[PDB]
Amino acid sequence: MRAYFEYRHLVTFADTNLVGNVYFTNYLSWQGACRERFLAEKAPKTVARMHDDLALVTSSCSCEFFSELYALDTVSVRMSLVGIDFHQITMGFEYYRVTDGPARLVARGEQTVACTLRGLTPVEVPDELRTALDAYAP
Template sequence: MTDTGHDAPDDARFEYRHTVAFAETDLCGRVDHVTFTRWQARCQELFLRERAPDVLGEEPDGPRLFTQQVECELLAPVAARDEIRIRLAWAEVGHTGLELAFDHIRTDEDGTSTLTARGRQRIACMSGRPGEAVPTLIPASLARALEHCRRPAQDPAEAASEAPPGEPDGEPCAEAGARRLVAPLAGSAP
């Protein structure tokens, strides 16, 4: 089973390559919804380990990432031995939270690529001791890592409205060297 993370060759997103194991399929030989979300979590873990390892620190009251919501839309079947690329990109970044987008792409035997699923993860950054955690600013190392993982715009109007982390109206964050989008994610604490 391949288990590697690296930059995607054709854009700025982070990519996790995986060969589907028989154990990851159901009785019909297909991959189910839960496995796709597990791959998203693995992709996120590899991204953090490679690009912002300090976010994975074990400080008892340091910043920690909490996944609040996960979704995955299945678009095409995936079976054992299929080669899959899971691409991570930021969809939205706020002061204390972010949303990551994932594209699951199967490389077929003839070399063509098929988008098999799209997913998202909504993540909150919290700090403090267990039971006393409060929202906190996204660590500077994570903000810098996300700058290189922007999801390509789907259409020209969308491209004009998107701004990568660190370039919105030039508003600096409280952490040295980091910059954030002005508005926090909807539903997250400021």
């Protein structure tokens, strides 16, 4: 089983603010880009269910910032499976600065998504998505 799923992003000017570093919200956006790239590549049919009856909703998210990223930096975001609780999936995120080559931890994050049906009713994690997560056991 693979330990992680890697997402890479080149930091551009819009990611930064007047202070000179990457604005904190962008770290959360990278969690979104990462988790949804995983869905596109590892569980395509699950996405089709979302336009129907399936509803994947973020229940919580968080991020801790150790060091700063700058413009034209390359960030490597590694997502790992923390655990599954019936309908809830918890992910872990590790942010690395890999601009000069060697990776250096600049931030650590975590978020939880819930699988529901269109009010909203908790439903067990779809088998396709469930099989995809099996290769990323902690």
